Design a protein around this ligand. Structure first.
Ligand code: HEM
Length: 250
């Protein structure tokens, strides 16, 4: 979630340009961002973010059942740019945007906006209403080309803030060996007993409900080998753009 990033990372963009969601949302899926080529001072413009995915997809939910995907994004503007207040947004723009509640990444960070989780069904495309600053009013702003960066996600992540895996990821063998037993649990999930003859050790690998098993009793496996297919149907992607803060004189 955006909140996880907000809580654990001071800045959502790393020195390499990687956006922090990628630390937990491990698969890569496209994202696109559209903005005008140029914008005049103190005027509102739209930053249109696309986080596309096959709407027929159903993902494994926390409970082990399959369900719909939700989407979310973090938009990083230059200092001085902000979310447009309601009094500056046209009623048309208003309805184009929809019922979205944009938030500042942190109260002191007005140039970084987050949104989500919200249903992918409705928000595969999200319009951020942005208010351009004014070089005439702000000394740290100028008539320049400015970069804009976005990170957009669809689907449950693979790792929690505490570093533990979620059920939306692949489960790998914790020991190489031969599978001596596979216990199918009543409400789903399994217990896989592995005998690592080489190290003379027995280990039991637990599989969460909702994943598809790839192994059978009597099968030999290696350490780290996948015991399940990767259930993840979602993904995180990044995009960038450049906008000219145009001199009204030109
Ligand atoms: C980065 C700013 C970031 C974004 C964007 C993001 C989005 C996001 C969405 C929209 C959801 C819901 C998905 C669904 O279909 O329901 C979601 C869920 C999870 N996230 Fe996330 N998330 C961002 C950041 C982070 C970070 C930094 C972590 C790891 C610390 C993380 C992890 C997760 C996990 C796990 C989930 C699933 C929770 C659950 O259903 O059990 N995200 N994220």
């Amino acid at each position: 979630y955006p909140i996880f990033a907000q809580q654990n990372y001071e800045n959502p963009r790393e020195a390499t340009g990687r956006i922090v969601c990628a630390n937990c949302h491990l698969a890569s899926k496209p994202v696109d961002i559209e903005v005008p080529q140029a914008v005049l001072p103190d005027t509102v413009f739209e930053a249109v973010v696309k986080i596309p995915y096959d709407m027929q997809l159903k993902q494994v939910l926390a409970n082990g059942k399959k369900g719909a995907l939700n989407v979310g994004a973090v938009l990083i503007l230059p200092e001085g740019f902000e979310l447009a207040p309601p009094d500056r947004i046209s009623p048309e723009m208003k309805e184009k945007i929809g019922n979205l509640s944009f938030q500042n990444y942190r109260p002191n960070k007005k140039n970084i906006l987050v949104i989500g989780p919200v249903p992918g069904q409705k928000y595969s495309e999200i319009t951020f209403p942005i208010l351009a600053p004014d070089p005439a009013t702000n000394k740290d702003v100028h008539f320049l080309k400015y970069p804009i960066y976005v990170g957009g996600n669809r689907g449950r992540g693979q790792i929690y803030p505490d570093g533990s895996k979620s059920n939306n990821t692949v489960y790998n063998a914790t020991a190489g060996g031969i599978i001596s037993k596979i216990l199918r649990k009543e409400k789903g999930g399994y217990e896989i007993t592995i005998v690592d003859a080489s190290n003379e050790r027995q280990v039991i690998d637990i599989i969460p409900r909702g994943l598809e098993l790839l192994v059978s009793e009597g099968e030999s496996i290696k350490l780290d080998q996948p015991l399940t297919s990767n259930p993840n149907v979602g993904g995180f992607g990044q995009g960038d753009a450049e906008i000219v803060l145009q001199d009204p004189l030109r």
